[PDB]
């Protein structure tokens, strides 16, 4: 709200459409002031001064020019319309994929990891407010592809192995939340001889003290 | 020799100073003079610094009002050497919730000409 | 517009004024196209917050990126592949060419930053701060992204790196041996050249006049009969220019759509791993790498393709 209230250029994308259409119409009207080789741009001047054999020649010149001016206008409107249509098609897609759902498409619904979006109406257009999750305050950790325990190679089920310099933990990938490495948050595959960079650490079995 | 003449300006709501670009020519043929690949730029001070592009001139050269008009090679952004290693990982300990705006045209004024 | 139609003839220039704003409209239309061309490039390549660099020591667990990374021994600082791509792909009548805002060096620099970001930090630099991760671990993440367990990557790391390195080498060999490979970019160059040459050749047209040469008319005839002959050349030359501009606007729209698609692929294939089928190559998408090319972009898509299937008996439940 504060940004829009303090930035005159914020809505240039919509203003340009208004301006381009206004400049096309004003250009078209101004062409009515053109002689196109005729004695006068004013059709009534021709009709009031000359009789039919010489007026028709002067009128033909105005018709030729005015027809050409209108054909130019319409062609430009068709090209401009096609561009607007594509913009509308994109807006409709964003409404479906950003507003009516959560998108995994990168940078389709704002910068960062998309959470949700809200539409707002605007003159001849739509404004989307994209809400994203942006990671912050990162820290450096030592990592490993796998943990070696009892001759078995262990991999994270849902996260990544990290060391704080002395102790190994497993954490979810996008948010630091270290947990003790156990049989419940890892899985086993093969022996420790194959994986490059495997490290030695204890893997805790929660049932061990129970039985 | 012939070509376009372009006037570079800040808004008149900021300054009445301008610079002139003589497109496609040498500075020696024109009659703060800088020869760009876009042509001869007169009225702007060339500097060896780099900034984000303000008013584009061409071929990597941009101009801005800094008071006087200056010309410079545009910066593409700040450098960042990522601390890569075969056993180092960076993990976020926090996050921010961000809201950004996207504006799209949907329709034109519906005109008709008789 | 004026120079094309009239050259330096004041007599023609004065006649051209009776037609109103047509020349202003045409100049405006071509200016709009030129601006869009710089916008197109920026939308595709300038998708990075910072200029990232790879580490001095290229140890990525067996994965070799030397063919896509910049070769510092060359002044252009292009990769081996980019250097190959670049090798493979009027004025006197008021027709001019304006330089791009971004130079080829600048485009290569953007491409390098995108590659460096991907190699050192995966998809994180496209969402926030660039977060480092070992490349093999990044690849393990991408295996999970296609429904393959991470131990499959780690247990076959040597094989996978070898298959990758060979596949990249084939790209270089393929381009080096296929003249038609870059037709999509060459066609754009050709179509634009054929439009400009056609426009210039129309200056040789009489359009019903005694001569195509405006000076011949002015030197031989006096004002009452010259104006008729000049009007014929103006009518034809104006029509020729209007045809040119209309075609450029239509062609520009097609290029814009292509640029829009390229920008989407940069975001969804390079700055992330896509689940969209056949959007980032054939097979299950792992990752992609951009390379710059004359007036375009080349994407190298890396995919996982299942092999050596066997028949088993199955059941819905036990
Ligand atoms: C990570 O460590 C490197 C040194 O290896 C240092 O330059 C970088 O700033 C550290 N990053 C963080 C988030 O602490
Ligand atoms: C690592 O975490 C453990 C358990 O919280 C703690 O006792 C230890 O001091 C930490 N090591 C370092 C270097 O912070
Ligand atoms: C990581 O690199 C160091 C050298 O800097 C090497 O000694 C070590 O064995 C490597 N470890 C892995 C898993 O690549
Ligand atoms: C991990 O433990 C095994 C079994 O004691 C030992 O043979 C191996 O050398 C250890 N690895 C390292 C890096 O210490
Ligand atoms: C023009 O300048 C005034 C200050 O003198 C400023 O308040 C106003 O916002 C400016 N207008 C624009 C469009 O920048
Ligand atoms: C005109 O500029 C070019 C560089 O763009 C230079 O090589 C040439 O010598 C200049 N001509 C004169 C007369 O200075
Ligand atoms: C810019 O640097 C060049 C040398 O590369 C030097 O000759 C020139 O005087 C410098 N100009 C300014 C304004 O610093
Ligand atoms: C996360 O950042 C916010 C500020 O944006 C701060 O107030 C909060 O305490 C931080 N949370 C943690 C756990 O550091
Ligand atoms: C990467 O590949 C190139 C080309 O085959 C080779 O010359 C280079 O030595 C390789 N680099 C490493 C570190 O193996
Ligand atoms: C699967 O079995 C069919 C016969 O039922 C055979 O034709 C087919 O080739 C076998 N496919 C594979 C991969 O062995």
Swiss-Prot record, chain C:
The chain holds residues 738 to 1081 of 1273 of the full protein. It comes from Severe acute respiratory syndrome coronavirus 2 (2019-nCoV). Residues 186-230 form a coiled coil. Changing residue 125 to L: In strain: Eta/B.1.525. Residues 157-207 are annotated as: Heptad repeat 1. Glycans are attached at residues 64, 311. This is Spike protein S2. Disulfide bonds join 1-23, 6-12, 269-280. It comes from the Viruses. Precursor of the fusion protein processed in the biosynthesis of the S protein and the formation of virus particle. Mediates fusion of the virion and cellular membranes by functioning as a class I viral fusion protein. Contains two viral fusion peptides that are unmasked after cleavage. The S2/S2' cleavage occurs during virus entry at the cell membrane by host TMPRSS2 or during endocytosis by host CSTL. The record marks 78-79 as: Cleavage.
């Amino acid at each position: 709200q504060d940004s829009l209230s303090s930035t005159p250029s914020a809505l240039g994308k919509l203003q340009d459409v208004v301006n381009q259409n206004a400049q096309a119409l004003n250009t078209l009207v101004k062409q009515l002031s053109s002689n196109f080789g005729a004695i006068s741009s004013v059709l009534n001047d021709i009709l009031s001064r000359l009789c039919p054999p010489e007026a028709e020649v002067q009128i033909d010149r105005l018709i030729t020019g005015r027809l050409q001016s209108l054909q130019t206008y319409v062609t430009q409107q068709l090209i401009r319309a096609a561009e607007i249509r594509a913009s509308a098609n994109l807006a409709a897609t964003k409404m479906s994929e950003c507003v009516l759902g959560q998108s995994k498409r990168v940078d389709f619904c704002g910068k960062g990891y998309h959470l949700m979006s809200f539409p707002q109406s605007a003159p001849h257009g739509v404004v989307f407010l994209h809400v994203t999750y942006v990671p912050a305050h990162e820290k450096n950790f030592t990592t490993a592809p796998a943990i070696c325990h009892d001759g078995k190679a262990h991999f994270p089920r849902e996260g990544v192995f990290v060391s704080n310099g002395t102790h190994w933990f497993v954490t979810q990938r996008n948010f630091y939340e270290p947990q003790i490495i156990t049989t419940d948050n890892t899985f086993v595959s093969g022996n420790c001889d194959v994986v490059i960079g495997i490290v030695n650490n204890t893997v805790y079995d929660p049932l061990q003290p129970e039985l | 020799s012939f070509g376009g003449v372009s006037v570079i300006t800040p808004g008149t709501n900021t300054s009445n100073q301008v610079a002139v670009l003589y497109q496609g020519v040498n500075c020696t043929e024109v009659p703060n003079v800088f020869q760009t690949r876009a042509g001869c730029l007169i009225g702007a001070e060339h500097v060896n610094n780099s900034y984000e592009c303000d008013i584009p001139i061409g071929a990597g050269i941009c101009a801005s009002y800094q008071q006087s008009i200056i010309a410079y090679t545009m910066s593409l952004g700040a450098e960042n050497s990522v601390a890569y290693s075969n056993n180092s990982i960076a993990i976020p300990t926090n996050f921010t919730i961000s809201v950004t705006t996207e504006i799209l045209p949907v329709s034109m004024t519906k005109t008709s000409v008789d | 517009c004026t120079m094309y139609i009239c050259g330096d003839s004041t007599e023609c220039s004065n006649l051209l004024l009776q037609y109103g704003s047509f020349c202003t409209q045409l100049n405006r239309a071509l200016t709009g196209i030129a601006v869009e061309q710089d916008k197109n490039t920026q939308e595709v390549f300038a998708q990075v917050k910072q200029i990232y660099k790879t580490p001095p020591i290229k140890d990525f667990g067996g994965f070799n990126f030397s063919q896509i990374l910049p070769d510092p021994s060359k002044p252009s600082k292009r990769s081996p592949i980019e250097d190959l791509l670049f090798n493979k792909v009027q004025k006197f009548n008021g027709l001019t060419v304006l330089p791009p805002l971004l130079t080829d060096e600048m485009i290569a620099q953007y491409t390098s930053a995108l590659l460096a970001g991907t190699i050192t930090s995966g998809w994180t630099f496209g969402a926030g701060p660039a977060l480092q991760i070992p490349f093999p671990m990044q690849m393990a993440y991408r295996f999970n992204g296609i429904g393959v367990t991470q131990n499959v990557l780690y247990e076959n790391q040597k094989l996978i790196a070898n298959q990758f390195n060979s596949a990249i080498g084939k790209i270089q060999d393929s381009l080096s041996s296929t003249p038609s490979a870059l037709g999509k970019l060459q066609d754009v160059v050709n179509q634009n050249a054929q439009a400009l040459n056609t426009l210039v050749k129309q200056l040789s047209s009489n359009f019903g006049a005694i001569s195509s040469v405006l000076n011949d008319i002015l030197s031989r005839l006096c004002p009452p009969e010259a104006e008729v002959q000049i009007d014929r050349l103006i009518t034809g030359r104006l029509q020729s220019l209007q045809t040119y501009v209309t075609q450029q606007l239509i062609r520009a729209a097609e290029i814009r759509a292509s640029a829009n698609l390229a920008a989407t692929k940069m975001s969804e294939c390079v700055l992330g791993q896509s689940k969209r089928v056949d959007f980032c190559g054939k097979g299950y998408h792992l990752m992609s790498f951009p390379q710059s090319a004359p007036h375009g972009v080349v994407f190298l898509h890396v995919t996982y393709v299942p092999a050596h299937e066997k028949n088993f008996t199955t059941a819905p439940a036990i």
